[PDB]
Design a binder for this molecule. Sequence first.
Ligand SMILES: Nc1nc2c(ncn2[C@@H]2O[C@H](COP(=O)(O)OP(=O)(O)O)[C@@H](O)[C@H]2O)c(=O)[nH]1
Ligand SMILES: [Mg+2]
Length: 170
Amino acid sequence: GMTEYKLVVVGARGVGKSALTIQLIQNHFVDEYDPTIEDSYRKQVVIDGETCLLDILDTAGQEEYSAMRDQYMRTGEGFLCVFAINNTKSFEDIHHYREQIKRVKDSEDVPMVLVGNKCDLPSRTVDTKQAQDLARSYGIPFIETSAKTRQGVDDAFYTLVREIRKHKEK
Ligand SMILES: Nc1nc2c(ncn2[C@@H]2O[C@H](COP(=O)(O)OP(=O)(O)O)[C@@H](O)[C@H]2O)c(=O)[nH]1
Ligand SMILES: [Mg+2]
């Protein structure tokens, strides 16, 4: 089979995980998608000439059993850590997602991309500079996105794939 990249989209409720994923996969913006639905989505794409499958888990938070969370973190190869630029608590929550994914995978080298979503909105509580500072500390890319206008969306997911490739080659 073509190479498959198992991607996982994490972040606080309301940041745009579902909207980002549906924009990537289906090329349209959702105003409303139940915050409690967690599902996986698939798309065959070409990234830097490679035809590959993206298998993307749009997470929604607590699971029936914590074992289910740990399972998707172990199977996931790369993580989009999403906050919204108008939600400071969602940015603060990134510290927890960073930790938890490393903790479950028992690894210091986990492919991740920091995503500041909703950049089409002028309303902003997290300046680009502060997010750059956090991404610098993690040694990962930082991309601002809008699921609404599509700005940055392919970049966020394709960059994550490229981070996975860099990890695999070691
Ligand atoms: N303006 C704007 N609204 C967004 C964007 N992404 C998501 N939203 C809205 O933010 C709310 C939460 O989005 P959703 O995808 O359900 O967030 P989730 O809980 O992280 O899955 C919804 O009303 C979306 O329409 C974006 O980039 N721009
Ligand atoms: Mg959602």
